[PDB]
Amino acid sequence: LGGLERFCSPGKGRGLRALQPFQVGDLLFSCPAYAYVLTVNERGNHCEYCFTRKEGLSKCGRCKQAFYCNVECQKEDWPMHKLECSPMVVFGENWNPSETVRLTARILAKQKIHPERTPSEKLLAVKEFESHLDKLDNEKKDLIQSDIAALHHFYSKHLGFPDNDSLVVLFAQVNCNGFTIEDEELSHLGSAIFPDVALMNHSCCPNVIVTYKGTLAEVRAVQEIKPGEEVFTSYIDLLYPTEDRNDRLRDSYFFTCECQECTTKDKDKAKVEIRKLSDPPKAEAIRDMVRYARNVIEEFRRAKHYKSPSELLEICELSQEKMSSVFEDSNVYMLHMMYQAMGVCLYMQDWEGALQYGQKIIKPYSKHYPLYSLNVASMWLKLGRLYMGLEHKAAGEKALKKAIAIMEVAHGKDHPYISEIKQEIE
Ligand SMILES: CCN(C(=O)CO)[C@H]1CN(/C(=N/C#N)Nc2cccc(OC(F)F)c2)N=C1c1ccc(Cl)c(Cl)c1
Ligand SMILES: C[S@@+](CC[C@H](N)C(=O)[O-])C[C@H]1O[C@@H](n2cnc3c(N)ncnc32)[C@H](O)[C@@H]1O
Ligand SMILES: [Zn+2]
Ligand SMILES: [Zn+2]
Ligand SMILES: [Zn+2]
Numbered sequence: 001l002g003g004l005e006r007f008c009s010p011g012k013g014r015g016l017r018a019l020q021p022f023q024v025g026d027l028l029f030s031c032p033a034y035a036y037v038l039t040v041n042e043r044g045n046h047c048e049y050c051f052t053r054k055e056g057l058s059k060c061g062r063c064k065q066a067f068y069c070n071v072e073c074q075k076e077d078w079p080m081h082k083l084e085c086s087p088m089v090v091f092g093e094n095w096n097p098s099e100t101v102r103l104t105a106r107i108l109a110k111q112k113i114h115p116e117r118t119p120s121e122k123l124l125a126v127k128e129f130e131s132h133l134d135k136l137d138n139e140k141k142d143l144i145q146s147d148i149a150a151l152h153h154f155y156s157k158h159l160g161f162p163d164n165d166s167l168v169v170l171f172a173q174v175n176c177n178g179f180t181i182e183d184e185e186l187s188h189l190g191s192a193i194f195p196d197v198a199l200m201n202h203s204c205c206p207n208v209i210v211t212y213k214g215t216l217a218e219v220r221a222v223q224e225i226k227p228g229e230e231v232f233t234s235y236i237d238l239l240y241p242t243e244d245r246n247d248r249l250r251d252s253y254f255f256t257c258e259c260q261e262c263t264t265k266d267k268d269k270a271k272v273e274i275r276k277l278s279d280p281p282k283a284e285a286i287r288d289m290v291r292y293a294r295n296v297i298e299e300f301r302r303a304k305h306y307k308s309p310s311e312l313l314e315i316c317e318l319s320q321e322k323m324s325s326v327f328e329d330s331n332v333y334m335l336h337m338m339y340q341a342m343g344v345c346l347y348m349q350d351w352e353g354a355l356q357y358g359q360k361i362i363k364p365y366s367k368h369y370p371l372y373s374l375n376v377a378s379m380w381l382k383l384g385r386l387y388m389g390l391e392h393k394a395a396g397e398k399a400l401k402k403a404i405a406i407m408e409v410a411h412g413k414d415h416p417y418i419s420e421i422k423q424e425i426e
Contacts, residue, residue: 012230031196100147111126180192300312358383
């Protein structure tokens with residue numbers, strides 16, 4: 001950092017520019033989390049302060065509902081954990097703020113405790129975050145209002161608040177600039193604010209990838225970067241077609257991408273691969289599958305909220321059956337449901353069924369994603385741990401090696417995950 005600088009990039013509000021070349025694999029900069037939270041389902045598995053996984057975690061005696069490496073982690077998290085420690089007890093069962101409210105509460109405590117610029121904000125301050133307030137519709141304002149309501153309700157014991165308009169601003173800023181922290185398998189660990197990382201604008205063919213080392217964000221080049229060019233990361237999963245991606249970006253971030261990918265659209269035809277039946281299906285038909293697919297994707301978002309693994313699995317198979325009438329297995333809509341089914345299979349400790357979906361998914365992933373992709377890497381990694389688990393040592397070794405090859409670029413040669421995975425090549 002300083003190796004680069006900010007600049008008021010066109011059509012793009014602000015963004016980040018290289019002053020020097022970066023090679024593939026190079027660490028552009030890193031950014032300690034300004035605020036963060038460990039996701040509720042990872043309670044008991046990871047330290048709430050540093051996010052390390054441990055079998056042996058010391059508990060908060062106070063509320064017996066937060067876990068730490070040791071008394072230093074616990075002490076260091078206290079200022080934040082105190083926002084939730086006693087209210088979890090008053091509320092018990094009914095303590096259930098969204099992750100966004102939990103993160104936003106910590107921002108507010110941070111601003112109070114440390115109003116000045118932090119090391120997390122060398123180029124973009126939290127106070128300066130784009131909010132797109134003027135673009136939010138009733139629905140999005142309504143959701144933020146719920147969030148404000150929840151915040152007051154749950155965090156009043158030890159937090160005071162600013163007026164409503166300031167809060168609406170803050171929550172909008174959070175949606176526009178908040179990150180998720182995910183592990184080596186892209187499992188959700190929590191959410192965070194990385195202000196200097198958030199200065200980076202998006203591309204569907206990014207030249208950098210963002211990874212996490214505990215709660216520290218790191219940014220590395222996945223294409224060579226020339227002096228004067230804009231540093232772009234991806235805000236979304238790059239698997240989907242150009243339309244599906246831009247619906248996402250406009251909805252979450254109020255812009256339409258004009259990157260080479262979203263322009264030429266060169267990868268679209270392959271993502272929507274169609275089966276060759278002596279007499280093909282006509283276009284009418286296709287639309288009805290495509291619409292049926294996305295539609296389903298939205299409906300599967302749901303059943304996770306409550307349905308049995310047995311019955312989530314069931315919908316994946318039926319949807320795949322139907323869909324395959326006209327879609328090839330290499331088709332992304334087929335890959336989505338395969339992926340989701342693989343997730344279900346892993347939750348049931350159904351290793352072999354997880355493995356079958358994995359094997360069908362990986363080769364299309366490599367086609368559809370770019371050269372260095374956390375999605376491809378985490379799929380190889382999952383394949384390799386499944387093979388090793390069934391004692392297919394040779395295939396496991398090969399798959400774990402493919403993940404390492406990507407991760408060395410994206411996470412760095414010395415990342416602790418690499419170290420873990422190398423030991424596993426055994
Ligand atoms: C898929 C890649 N992303 C990751 O965060 C990867 O770790 C997206 C996804 N994204 C968010 N998703 C969610 N949820 N951010 C987010 C959005 C709303 C709220 C939120 O935190 C909540 F706790 F407040 C976090 N935010 C992302 C993101 C990526 C790059 C940049 Cl520069 C920024 Cl500002 C956001
Ligand atoms: C995390 S911010 C990036 C920093 C932002 N450009 C700024 O000055 O605050 C997310 C926002 O930046 C803008 N942005 C990012 N990538 C863009 C792109 N490719 N084209 C246009 N605007 C973009 C969008 O307004 C987006 O919601
Ligand atoms: Zn506690
Ligand atoms: Zn710790
Ligand atoms: Zn694009």
